[PDB]
Design a protein around this ligand. Structure first.
Ligand code: HEM
Ligand SMILES: [Co+2]
Length: 291
């Protein structure tokens, strides 16, 4: 199956910068969310869960179709804790009804990452909403109680290699886990509304202890009150992953370039851009607009 990007009828880079700006301004407006974490981390996770449904073997799932708008997918157990980010975006869709759902969910994550002082992430429009019957069944998103072999194997389905995996997992500098969503509890670090390489430094520098939690799942805890999922921990248990973790912990510039590429790829897997499709767009932050 082939999904060909189709640019929203007469839209252009400034139309999409407007939508960016709208999401960015609402991030500021609602920055009290989750005792001032803000909605940024939730939007990044949202954009990853909408994209993470892709199966490269038959091109099912993926961001192009905007299928998260159907109750089968937004009620996926794996998507618990994303309902507020979804509701966040709803009025903005109402403000810009010409944009497709997948373009909107994808753009939410690009916007969040940039506004949280992360790398610029080029973005491309043209995802086209696809009907209810194309929604992917539940179960395509990764489990957290697993090891490096699982992770490596899992991400192969998303066409991601070891560097891309380690780079993408770096978004766990953002936000936190909550028992009520995922059965895990705590943040990975202190500055969890800022996009930095802190995840890698914490993995490497903190003393970690396997402990069982209130949901009877096991997770790795530090006395500073940080935590690592077993799949996060697997990144230093595996020699090849460990090497790249060290690389990003030592060079945030390198992490930013690698993350930007991997995240764009993640968001665009499944999509065929025609020969005369427009080039990727890089959005200015509010800051760069003096807004
Ligand atoms: C083996 C792959 C993955 C696993 C098992 C995993 C697991 C989880 C867990 C269970 C949490 C907590 C959710 C909660 O309780 O609300 C979560 C949070 C988060 N994850 Fe992942 N994740 C992985 C990959 C990714 C990737 C690739 C990214 C981004 C490129 C992503 C970004 C996020 C974000 C930003 C949050 C915080 C959301 C919040 O605070 O609102 N994760 N992850
Ligand atoms: Co949350």
């Amino acid at each position: 199956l082939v999904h060909v990007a189709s640019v929203e009828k007469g839209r252009s880079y400034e139309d999409f910068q407007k939508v960016y700006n709208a999401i960015a301004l609402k991030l500021r407006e609602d920055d009290e969310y989750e005792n001032y974490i803000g909605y940024g981390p939730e939007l990044v996770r949202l954009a990853w869960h909408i994209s993470g449904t892709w199966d490269k073997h038959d091109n099912t799932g993926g961001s192009y179709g905007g299928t998260y708008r159907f109750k089968k997918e937004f009620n996926d157990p794996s998507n618990a804790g994303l309902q507020n980010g979804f509701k966040f975006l709803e009025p903005i869709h109402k403000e810009f009804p010409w944009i497709s759902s997948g373009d909107l969910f994808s753009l939410g994550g690009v916007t969040a990452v940039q506004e949280m002082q992360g790398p610029k992430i080029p973005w491309r429009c043209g995802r086209v909403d696809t009907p209810e019957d194309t929604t992917p069944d539940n179960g395509r998103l990764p489990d957290a109680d697993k090891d490096a072999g699982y992770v490596r194997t899992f991400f192969q389905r998303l066409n991601m290699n070891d560097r891309e995996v380690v780079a993408l997992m770096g978004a766990h500098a953002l936000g936190k886990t909550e028992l009520k969503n995922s059965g895990y509890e705590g943040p990975w670090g202190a500055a969890n509304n800022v996009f930095t390489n802190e995840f890698y430094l914490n993995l490497l520098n903190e003393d970690w202890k396997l402990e069982k939690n209130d949901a009877n799942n096991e997770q790795w805890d530090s006395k500073s009150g940080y935590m690592m999922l077993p799949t996060d921990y697997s990144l230093i248990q595996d020699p090849k992953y460990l090497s790249i973790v060290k690389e990003y912990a030592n060079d945030q510039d390198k992490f930013f370039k690698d993350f930007s590429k991997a995240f764009e790829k993640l968001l665009e897997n499944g999509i065929t851009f025609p020969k005369d499709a427009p080039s990727p767009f890089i959005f200015k932050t509010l800051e760069e607009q003096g807004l």
